[PDB]
Design an enzyme around this catalytic site. Sequence first.
Site, PDB file in Angstrom:
ATOM      1  N   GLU A 133       0.821  -1.205   0.000  1.00 29.55           N
ATOM      2  CA  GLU A 133       0.000   0.000   0.000  1.00 29.55           C
ATOM      3  C   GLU A 133       0.865   1.269   0.000  1.00 29.55           C
ATOM      4  OE1 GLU A 133      -2.810  -0.682   3.158  1.00 29.55           O
ATOM      5  OE2 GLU A 133      -3.830  -2.258   1.986  1.00 29.55           O
ATOM      6  N   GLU A 167      -4.522  -8.728  -1.541  1.00 27.11           N
ATOM      7  CA  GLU A 167      -4.810  -8.737  -0.112  1.00 27.11           C
ATOM      8  C   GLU A 167      -6.250  -8.272   0.056  1.00 27.11           C
ATOM      9  OE1 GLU A 167      -2.228  -6.431   2.771  1.00 27.11           O
ATOM     10  OE2 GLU A 167      -4.203  -5.817   3.470  1.00 27.11           O
TER      11      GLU A 167
END
Lengths: 74, 385
Positions: free
Chosen positions: B67, B185
């Site tokens: 991220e 994810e």
Amino acid sequence: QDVVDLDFFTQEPLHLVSPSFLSVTIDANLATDPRFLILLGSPKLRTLARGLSPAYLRFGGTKTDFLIFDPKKE
Amino acid sequence: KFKNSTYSRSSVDVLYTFAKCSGLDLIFGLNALLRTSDGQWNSSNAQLLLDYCASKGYNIDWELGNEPNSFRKKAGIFINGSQLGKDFIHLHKLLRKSTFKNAKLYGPDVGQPRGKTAKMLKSFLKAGGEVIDAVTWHHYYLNGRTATLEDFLNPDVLDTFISQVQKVLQVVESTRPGKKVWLGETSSAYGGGAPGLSDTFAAGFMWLDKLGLSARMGIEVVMRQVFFGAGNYHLVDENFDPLPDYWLSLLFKKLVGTKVLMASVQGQDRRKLRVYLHCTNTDNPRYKEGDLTLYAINLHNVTKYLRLPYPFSNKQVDQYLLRPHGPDGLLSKSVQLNGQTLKMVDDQTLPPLKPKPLRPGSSLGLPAFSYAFFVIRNAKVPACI
Ligand SMILES: [N+]
């Protein structure tokens, strides 16, 4: 009423997914648990994981960018 | 507290051995926040790890960073997409120089676009998309701290995933057409999952629906957060007990094949009756080329009866119906298959997952708030053969 008719399209596939379509992760933070080696050795856990083969196992998460490899660590 | 910690060769070894002995393929995320004074990725630490894994003969695929869209908030540093792409190119070169035979590289593991546009994903793919083998992004429906059972049963919540998928795919189509797209994810709720919710039968609607829509909309791989860990969305808790979503995933693995077809309801679509259709998994010894696996979600508060279209009506159908077990209802952590609670036989033995054969020509009964797989036998679908 409560009976629903279905339409199917089966002429040819819309897509092909990987044989590993349903894959799983282990969060990078688990490597900070002092029991890490013992936990991943569980026979029960290995049995459960094998049920999901073929699959990718991604080791990552927020701690991905806060973990450092130490090749001298015991 | 400082998030920075170290990990050993032994830790790498046990993770690789866990993957290898379970028949899984390990992907290892490298630390992207090691930076030079010139704003580049400092590859020194990763080089040590690559060298070690190559020396050991480990077959491992790699990612770099997690991220990156939140680096500014989480680490006080902003790395733009062009620079992240250059870092991935550097890592690609290191992998080519290694003794790894065909190590794959995935990225950038960006968070979902939300209402905004994936500007960082686009610049990343322009700069570094040539060296990645699949684009990874993440998705959660809800904040685990505020999610309620009602949200987990809400078709409007489920449908929000469609727009997130479309936004990512549009960005990839415009920069790297036909590049594979993966959910790297993903789960029901962020912040560790919703307590007493993400580990229950009720979590199954979001999980099965996400798989169905991902397959139908061109996502090639979906990586469930997490197989095992402390988060409430774990498939297996730290007593090593499987949650209902584990059994849902096991049945999916056994029954659902790689060829994605399409199913829909004829009537008005209230979006509470959700249907998906693939060829049956050919690895399943019970079934043969041409068989179909229908899976379905019923979010109505009453039973619905599905009628198969001709000629699949009057075919033999195998039912795999999942319902919660015990007094907790939808919030139960135990699940029954065709009325039999699913439990390991012992620590090394999964239970038989026995179908219930239905009378040919019968409509398929789906109770309120339930989901099921139906295998249509001898469907003889040429697209599946
Ligand atoms: N950029």
